[PDB]
Design a protein around this ligand. Sequence first.
Ligand SMILES: O=S1(=O)NCN(C2CC2)c2ccc(F)cc21
Ligand SMILES: O=S1(=O)NCN(C2CC2)c2ccc(F)cc21
Ligand SMILES: C=C(C)[C@H]1CN[C@H](C(=O)O)[C@H]1CC(=O)O
Ligand SMILES: C=C(C)[C@H]1CN[C@H](C(=O)O)[C@H]1CC(=O)O
Ligand SMILES: [Cl-]
Lengths: 253, 254
Amino acid sequence: RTLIVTTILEEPYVMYRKSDKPLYGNDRFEGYCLDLLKELSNILGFLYDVKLVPDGKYGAQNDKGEWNGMVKELIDHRADLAVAPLTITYVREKVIDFSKPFMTLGISILYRKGTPIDSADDLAKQTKIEYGAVRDGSTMTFFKKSKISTYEKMWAFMSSRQQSALVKNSDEGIQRVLTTDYALLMESTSIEYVTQRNCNLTQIGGLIDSKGYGVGTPIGSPYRDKITIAILQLQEEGKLHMMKEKWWRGNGC
Amino acid sequence: RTLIVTTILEEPYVMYRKSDKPLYGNDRFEGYCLDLLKELSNILGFLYDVKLVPDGKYGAQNDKGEWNGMVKELIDHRADLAVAPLTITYVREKVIDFSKPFMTLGISILYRKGTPIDSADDLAKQTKIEYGAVRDGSTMTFFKKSKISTYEKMWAFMSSRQQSALVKNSDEGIQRVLTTDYALLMESTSIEYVTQRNCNLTQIGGLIDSKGYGVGTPIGSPYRDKITIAILQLQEEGKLHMMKEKWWRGNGCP
Ligand SMILES: O=S1(=O)NCN(C2CC2)c2ccc(F)cc21
Ligand SMILES: O=S1(=O)NCN(C2CC2)c2ccc(F)cc21
Ligand SMILES: C=C(C)[C@H]1CN[C@H](C(=O)O)[C@H]1CC(=O)O
Ligand SMILES: C=C(C)[C@H]1CN[C@H](C(=O)O)[C@H]1CC(=O)O
Ligand SMILES: [Cl-]
């Protein structure tokens, strides 16, 4: 029995391994999520085949309430597990079964260093500095749904002018921050990774919410609870902490 | 059916209300967990009866492998939910079904201010300053079972001399920190609560692990996934954060 694991390319979770000759199967990939999969399969004793999600999406609902991405792969039983930086959210948890979190994160702000900006409130009350998030990701959704006045104000701005302040993916966001007067609303784990490698960038303020990434399984999956117990074991042994350090640590600034 | 909720007195999660007359039922109690219970029952539409765990324990095993505390109340179906600072752990998650976490924490160190101690390593390296944890809690268990060299060394110390370095509860640990040359290994959420109120105490170093508290339900319970979904809703609405601020805010310290 070989489990199908849906995932998505995202540094440093899942990356194409560098090679001068064609690579095949699981050997095509490396990263934090490949290391996690190895540790999980060690503990639980399953074989697995990693498969990139065909539409290249994480999982959001459209106008008609239809799902896409890795979430949809789980719902349709085309995958057994999703192992990726898949944010645990209310809307997703209703349609798939998440394991307990293997990594914590919060939404925060990525911006260049040396400015007087110190919080989301600072961005909210002005219009000169543009700010946004990855379109249709869980960060954008948090702002779209929030009733906290500061975050409603930010969503009004982000969604204005045909969402010109939003970006298609994190890399586009990062380049926009580097080049123009732009701040990106980004998950703190990704911010840590980026600021380890771009000495001109920094996190602005603290975390505005509190959540995590979990392994996704279809509703009713017998693996969900086993995966959860494996994750708790890895946490208590210090292994999740070591894995993060391995993939996050940059060359120093 | 009205759900039976097992819990335990622990400030500021669950406390006796102050009044001029005897109190009865749920009206006996107030605190973070009662607020959480109220929000959960409002979302899910259940009634509830809060019942203090008869043995006054959180949940661990004896040599025979029999569980006690709130964990045991769930295993035997004497309670439908456990709402308390019940730490999500490997051994416990095997025998009950935890919801997703409603609060994060990690083990850290409570000590007096103004000293050069800055990490668990600084403590493990010496024998002058005593250090310990609450007996039989998840913090003690972390040390007992760790294979990390520094934490092994620390467990050797803690367990020595018939565990004279351990304490029976947090209040005892806090007084020992205040009175003697002693550092208490304590969940960061509780450290935060104490240090907001006593400027003589501080947290030393960072969190040495990463976990959370979850609502406990018996294995197979239909309520676990519903409670999880309610908790995500409360988190995303900013309500869990507000609730923490309501109960944790002291004056703070310079
Ligand atoms: O999305 S969760 O399962 N529940 C919400 N929480 C916050 C502690 C309330 C957290 C905090 C850290 C996580 F890793 C996961 C979660
Ligand atoms: O006990 S858990 O469900 N899984 C372990 N983790 C650590 C992020 C790995 C966390 C982190 C924060 C929590 F609130 C719960 C948990
Ligand atoms: C990298 C992307 C687009 C993902 C990763 N976690 C979030 C999710 O699971 O929706 C997205 C980021 C974000 O929305 O800030
Ligand atoms: C207050 C107590 C004894 C509890 C709270 N959570 C931990 C548990 O659920 O085991 C214990 C604290 C600790 O072990 O530091
Ligand atoms: Cl769960």
